[PDB]
Every structure is written in structure tokens, then in C-alpha cells.
Design a protein around this nucleic acid. Structure first.
Ligand code: MMC
Ligand code: MG
Ligand code: MG
Ligand code: MG
Ligand code: MG
Ligand code: MG
Ligand code: MG
Ligand code: MG
Ligand code: MG
Ligand code: MG
Ligand code: MG
Ligand code: MG
Ligand code: MG
Ligand code: MG
Ligand code: MG
Ligand code: MG
Ligand code: MG
Ligand code: MG
Ligand code: MG
Ligand code: MG
Ligand code: MG
Ligand code: MG
Ligand code: MG
Ligand code: MG
Ligand code: MG
Length: 87
RNA sequence: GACACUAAGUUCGGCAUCAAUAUGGUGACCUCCCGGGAGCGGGGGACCACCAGGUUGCCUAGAGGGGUGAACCGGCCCAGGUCGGAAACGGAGCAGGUCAAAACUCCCGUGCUGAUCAGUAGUGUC
């Protein structure tokens, strides 16, 4: 499973990446936040710093990868909820 | 005879060339879900344009015909580059073309109004 950071960015529109609802989208998603949340779910992430979402080719913001096999969306919503449980 | 008004009859300008509303199609921006290995695929929501269009009736007045570039926004095609991919291909945006539409123009038609002619049509006036 491939998790492009754009999938959870609150600053990005739907057509620009966002796969997660507005109420769950994260302010500044980072590969660590995604790696940490994924590790909190008992999974094993794999960060790839050099790789760019085609909808933002100019921007080199990595991408993580996990073996997970469930609802990609569910997983994403869940990693969004983890990232904010204490301001 | 004379003067009015009521049309119309010339001769030249000035302009206008529907408004108000349902249903349907398409499309950007936005939003939500379902699906997929990545790029992506699919369905819904709202809104605002536009193309079709049933109904309704006032504004000096189930109706047209061309055209152009180009404030801006959009379709479509399609480079180079670039990104995802083993590849097929898919993406973000440009240059390029192209269409639609904003817009502005020309034409025909129907009229309104201004002046100019003459003064026949009709009831008035003295
Ligand atoms: C993991 Hg949902
Ligand atoms: Mg909301
Ligand atoms: Mg943070
Ligand atoms: Mg789609
Ligand atoms: Mg129009
Ligand atoms: Mg028609
Ligand atoms: Mg009718
Ligand atoms: Mg009028
Ligand atoms: Mg009228
Ligand atoms: Mg009149
Ligand atoms: Mg009709
Ligand atoms: Mg655009
Ligand atoms: Mg190319
Ligand atoms: Mg191209
Ligand atoms: Mg093809
Ligand atoms: Mg494209
Ligand atoms: Mg262009
Ligand atoms: Mg050119
Ligand atoms: Mg041309
Ligand atoms: Mg037009
Ligand atoms: Mg003019
Ligand atoms: Mg004109
Ligand atoms: Mg008059
Ligand atoms: Mg007058
Ligand atoms: Mg009498």
C-alpha cells in the first residue's frame, strides 16, 4: 500500500490529492507523522524520501509504504486520527 | 377659405432590437463515498455558467442571419520538459492550435422616436 502525503493534507483540495475528509485532514503532513502513526498501528512503514506525487511534480515530499491489506481509506482516516490526540 | 388634431404618403438622422419563470443535457471550482498496485477508476452533493426548452405576461418598440478578435474563466487536441510506472499508459501545468462562451460588430426583418417634405384620407375649430 502506498501512502502519498497529499492524501491527508488539509491545505490541499480533493483534486490536488486529499483523500481524507476535511475534519480529519492534517495541517502539515510529514513522512515521520505517517511513519509514527503507522508504527502505532503495529505496522511496518518504509519511507521513500525521493519520490513525488505527479499532481505536484515540482515538490519532493516522499511517500511511505506498508504491507497493510484493508480499506486504504480506513487506514488513512485512522492515521489521521492518531496524528492529533493532544494539541 | 383658414387652423387644428387623426392616420398614413415622402425625404434624411437617432436608437431598440423581449422580460419573468419550471423541468433536462453538459462543464469548470468545491465537497463526500465505493474501488484500485502507483499514475488512477466509479457514484453522489452543492453551487455557478452555458446548450437545449414547457409555461407566463408589463416595460418608447413555442422571432432571425453572419462576423472578429481575445480582459478574464472554460472544452478539446495536442508538443517539448517533468512526475508515477517494467511497460502500457496515467498526471500536474505550460507553449501551440481549436472550439464554445463574455464581449463587441455587420446584415435582414419588425418597430419607437427626431427632423424634413408635401399636403390628398377623417372628425373637429372658426
Ligand atoms: C487500519 Hg483501519
Ligand atoms: Mg464542511
Ligand atoms: Mg506536525
Ligand atoms: Mg475520478
Ligand atoms: Mg447569453
Ligand atoms: Mg432552438
Ligand atoms: Mg402555452
Ligand atoms: Mg421598452
Ligand atoms: Mg414594451
Ligand atoms: Mg408610441
Ligand atoms: Mg421547443
Ligand atoms: Mg485550469
Ligand atoms: Mg510530452
Ligand atoms: Mg501535452
Ligand atoms: Mg491512449
Ligand atoms: Mg493532463
Ligand atoms: Mg495554452
Ligand atoms: Mg498564438
Ligand atoms: Mg483563427
Ligand atoms: Mg455570445
Ligand atoms: Mg459603438
Ligand atoms: Mg452600431
Ligand atoms: Mg412621439
Ligand atoms: Mg419632436
Ligand atoms: Mg360639429
Amino acid at each position: 500500500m502506498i501512502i502519498w502525503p497529499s492524501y491527508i493534507d488539509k491545505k490541499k483540495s480533493r483534486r490536488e490529492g486529499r483523500k481524507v475528509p476535511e475534519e480529519l485532514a492534517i495541517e502539515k503532513p510529514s513522512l515521520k507523522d505517517i511513519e509514527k502513526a503507522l508504527k502505532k498501528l503495529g505496522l511496518e512503514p518504509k519511507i521513500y524520501r525521493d519520490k513525488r506525487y505527479p499532481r505536484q511534480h515540482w515538490e519532493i515530499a516522499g511517500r511511505v509504504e506498508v504491507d497493510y491489506k484493508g480499506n486504504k481509506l480506513c487506514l488513512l482516516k485512522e492515521i489521521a486520527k492518531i496524528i492529533k490526540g493532544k494539541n
